[PDB]
């Protein structure tokens, strides 16, 4: 169900992304509200695009984890934490990660173009 | 910065596409303006879609260069001209290039379907 996994562990909750994705889209202020919802959806889709993840719910990149952002092990993060707690713990780093993701995709696109250029 | 590379050469400008793309989304008349901006964004996304380029900013295709559109050499185009000059240079050929890209992607998708059919 929609947000049913909100209190579940991050690992289990990763299997419910489909429901929230479908639930992001579902008088002047009603039209304004619909336009704002569309703008937020498109900003998120463009942000995934710049990361090379436009077609996936889960995508891996080449950006390493700093470990200063969070020094918890994968077992603690995925089994003993909720997504709300995780979001709070890295609230000060999210835009840095976003910048690194954009730079990584730019390097991947240029490297891919150069590899394709070879005969 | 936004359009900061506008006066730079095409090669240098190709490295700043991310900032310009991210800033494209950023009583009744302003709501109409927001809807129009969204429609133009989606038109561009759909044009990339039908060409098979929806997932990236730099998308190489299988359409060869005609050389009648512009007979400048590769070095001249990328190292001397700016993107405004390039847009003027081929302003009369855009409707042909887009059609060829559409046909090329259609043939590519049909070929992929035929290749997947092989046991």
């Amino acid at each position, epitope marked *: 169900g929609f947000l049913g996994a909100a209190g579940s562990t991050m690992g289990a909750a990763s299997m419910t992304l489909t429901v929230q994705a479908r639930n992001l889209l579902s008088g002047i202020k009603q039209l304004q509200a619909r336009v704002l919802a569309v703008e937020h959806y498109l900003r998120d889709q463009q942000l995934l695009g710049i990361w090379g993840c436009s077609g996936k719910l889960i995508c891996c990149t080449n950006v390493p984890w700093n470990s200063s952002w969070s020094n918890r092990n994968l077992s603690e993060i995925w089994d003993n934490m909720t997504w709300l707690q995780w979001d709070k713990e890295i609230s000060n780093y999210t835009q840095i990660i976003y910048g690194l993701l954009e730079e990584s995709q730019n390097q991947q696109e*240029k*490297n891919e173009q150069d*590899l394709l*250029a070879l005969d | 910065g936004f359009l900061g590379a506008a006066g730079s050469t095409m090669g240098a400008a190709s490295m700043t596409l991310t900032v310009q793309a991210r800033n494209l989304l950023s009583g009744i008349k302003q709501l109409q303006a927001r809807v129009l901006a969204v429609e133009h964004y989606l038109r561009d996304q759909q044009l990339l879609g039908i060409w098979g380029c929806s997932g990236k900013l730099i998308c190489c295709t299988n359409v060869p260069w005609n050389s009648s559109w512009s007979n400048r050499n590769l070095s001249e185009i990328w190292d001397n001209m700016t993107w405004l000059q390039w847009d003027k240079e081929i302003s009369n050929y855009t409707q042909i290039i887009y059609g060829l890209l559409e046909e090329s992607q259609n043939q590519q998708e049909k070929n992929e379907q035929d290749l997947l059919a092989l046991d």
Partner: antibody, heavy 123, light 106 residues
Framework: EVQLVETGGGLVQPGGSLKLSCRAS????????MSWVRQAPGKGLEWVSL????????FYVDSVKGRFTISRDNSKNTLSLQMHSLRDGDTAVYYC??????????????????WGQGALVTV | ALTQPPSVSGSPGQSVTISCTGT?????????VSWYQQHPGKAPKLMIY???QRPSGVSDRFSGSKSGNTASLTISGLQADDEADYYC???????????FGGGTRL
């Protein structure tokens, strides 16, 4: 116009590691791809490795891929080749050269043009 | 590898052809066959690149040729300073980038 100077080791025991570093004048490293090509002591030239203008991509012959790494630092205008395992079939004069590829915004080169004086590596 | 004659015998007033033969797939597909002149004791100098192109600093007496799965360097007006080991090299694609032959002493 362009000068390539290589600094590195000489006779080294088998099983160790060496780093051969090429410095150059006359061009910016970030604008050109560069390679390492070696002269067999008694025969001709063999290409060893090629690195892209930006340094993002590295290529090797299969006979060296497991022993040689090509690396670039544009800020220091330094190209380097790190070699490991040091099989005694690696004795050669190693030359630093420019070219070998492009980034598709310049006409493809697919040849080497400027050459250094090389360094003799023995094992 | 590419084949190449171990040596040729030039003389004043004559033209000499230095041949090179490789795999027909790599040579025919990739028309990037260059020639270098390696003076004894010195690094190789690029003399010819592409089938018919020449770099700055090399006079017109040096000219490349390609046919079938073979290529050659033709030199006329041989000078005393031209007596060096010539090498051919060709692009082999993405799995192997370059194929080299041996040296030909003038």
């Amino acid at each position: 116009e362009v000068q390539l100077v290589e600094t590195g080791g000489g006779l080294v025991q088998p099983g160790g590691s060496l780093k051969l570093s090429c410095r150059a004048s006359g061009y910016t490293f970030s604008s050109f791809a560069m390679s390492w090509v070696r002269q067999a002591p008694g025969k001709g030239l063999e290409w060893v490795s090629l690195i892209n203008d930006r340094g993002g991509l590295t290529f090797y012959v299969d006979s060296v891929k497991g022993r040689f790494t090509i690396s670039r630092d544009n800020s220091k205008n330094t190209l380097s080749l790190q070699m490991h395992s040091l099989r005694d079939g690696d004795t050669a004069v190693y030359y630093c050269a420019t070219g070998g590829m492009s980034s598709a915004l310049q006409s493809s080169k697919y040849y080497f043009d400027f050459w250094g004086q090389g360094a003799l590596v023995t094992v | 590898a590419l084949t190449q004659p171990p040596s040729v015998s030039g003389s004043p007033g004559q033209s000499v052809t230095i041949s090179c033969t490789g795999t027909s797939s790599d040579i025919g597909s990739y028309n990037y066959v260059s020639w270098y002149q390696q003076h004894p004791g010195k690094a190789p100098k690029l003399m010819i690149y592409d089938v018919t192109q020449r770099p700055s600093g090399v006079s017109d007496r040096f000219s490349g040729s390609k046919s079938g799965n073979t290529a050659s360097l033709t030199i006329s007006g041989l000078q005393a300073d031209d007596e060096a080991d010539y090498y051919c090299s060709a692009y082999a694609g993405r799995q192997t980038f370059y194929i080299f032959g041996g040296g030909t002493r003038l």
